[PDB]
Amino acid sequence: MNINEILKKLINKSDLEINEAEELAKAIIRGEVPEILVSAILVALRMKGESKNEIVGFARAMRELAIKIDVPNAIDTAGGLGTVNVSTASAILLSLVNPVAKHGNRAVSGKSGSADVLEALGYNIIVPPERAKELVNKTNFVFLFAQYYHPAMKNVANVRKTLGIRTIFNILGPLTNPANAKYQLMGVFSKDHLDLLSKSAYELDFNKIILVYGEPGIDEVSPIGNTFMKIVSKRGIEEVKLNVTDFGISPIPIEKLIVNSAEDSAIKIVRAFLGKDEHVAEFIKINTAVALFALDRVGDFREGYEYADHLIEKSLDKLNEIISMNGDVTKLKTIVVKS
């Protein structure tokens, strides 16, 4: 395990082995490598172009140092333009029919982060591992706040912050779900990452994970047009192109799906749960639809959309019980107040 060997290897643009990558990651995460080297390695790593094995190596290193809870039977809706936080809203409909272990963080792009939205609704986003398991059984849903679960990460913080650029770590979050959930919907920000991250995921041991990229470029199912997804399972990777019409609806005006703050997102969500905002509701449903498909609850996406319609109608109540059993219900009520 010689950093300098590795660094030179990377500069020479030579991909690493899953093992090389994993050891290097462990070291970096454990804070055993000097800031100057981490900086250099990440930069080289990016300029060379991270490869599947390296993604896998790092992913494995990550999982190994995180605080874990066991709920592999759970599903997660993994993760810009500033759209309302669908994944989260969507995690709520899902909790009605299956345990949900939502991995998430605040945002670095103006309040919109799933942790912020939840915090806005009154949810107490800091859930200790012990009570986490409890909540999942008691309500079928729990939020795993990333900062609280990847404490080892602090050792790379300074470098990441100082560099202020995209490193390999930026695409690891969604592949490092604390609860080890086997069922998951994962959004990526670029088609390239679709292929890359899918192949990477194929080796991270998943029952079923669906990666998706939607026009005009979002880490979610496209509300306006084509959505490109990679279905990864124990037996391979399947490509699947899709159009928002295939759900049986007409394209949603992107203008309506955008938010400007955590509370603004919350309101748009709750309004959708009330039937006061069809656009947002449809956005939440085409996404939940794909997730339902990942759970094998439906056979086609149209079926999935339909099912989701039934779910959304019971979602505000579900949300209420979730927040009430871990958070401030009133903050939720004030948000309900026509908002």
Q: Write out the residues near a second copy by the rule CB under 8 A.
A: 4, 7-8, 11, 13, 34-40, 42-44, 46-48, 158-159, 162-165
Pick between residue 167 and residue 200 the one whose CB is nearest to a second copy: 167
Amino acid at 277: D
- Tell me which residues in 173-202 interact with Mg ion (CB under 5 A): 187
Place of tokens 């959930």: 181
Among 159, 118, 124, which Cα is nearest to 263's?
A: 118
- The reply to whether 14 sits in an annotated binding site is no
> Which residues, other chains included, contact 334 with Cβ-Cβ below 8 Å and sequence gap of 6+?
none
User: What is the pattern of x (binds Mg ion, CB under 5 A) and - over residues 18-47?
Assistant: ------------------------------
- The reply to whether 102 sits in an annotated binding site is yes
Residue 222 interacts with Mg ion (CB under 5 A): yes or no = no
Burial class from Cβ neighbours inside 10 Å (0-12, 13-18, 19+) for residue 89 reads buried
Count Cα neighbours of 160 within 13 Å in the Cβ-side half-sphere: 13
Give the residue nearest to Mg ion (CB). 79
Least gap, CB of 24 to Mg ion (angstroms): 28
Residue 219 interacts with Mg ion (CB under 5 A): yes or no = yes
- The reply to whether 339 sits in an annotated binding site is no
Task: Report d(CA 280, CA 60) in Å as an integer.
Answer: 36
Put residue 227 in one of left, alpha, beta given phi > 0 → left and psi -120 to 50 → alpha.
beta
Task: Render 1-61 in DSSP notation, one character per residue.
Answer: --HHHHHHHHHTT-PPPHHHHHHHHHHHHTT-S-HHHHHHHHHHHHHH---HHHHHHHHHH
Residue 128 contacts which entry, a second copy, Mg ion, none (Cβ below 5-8 A, type-dependent): none
Buried b (16+ CB within 10 A) or exposed e, 114-128: bbbbbbbbbbebebe
Pick between residue 126 and residue 165 the one whose CB is nearest to a second copy: 165
- The reply to whether 107 sits in an annotated binding site is yes
Residue 76 interacts with Mg ion (CB under 5 A): yes or no = no
Residue 11 contacts which entry, a second copy, Mg ion, none (Cβ below 5-8 A, type-dependent): a second copy
- The reply to whether 133 sits in an annotated binding site is no
Least gap, CB of 227 to a second copy (angstroms): 26
Residue ranges at the known binding site: 77-79, 83, 85-88, 102-110, 114, 160, 219-220
Residue ranges at the known binding site for 5-phospho-alpha-D-ribose 1-diphosphate: 77-79, 83, 85-88, 102-110, 114
Under the rule (CB under 5 A), what is the footprint of Mg ion?
Answer: 79, 87, 187, 219-220
Residue ranges at the known binding site for anthranilate: 79, 105, 160
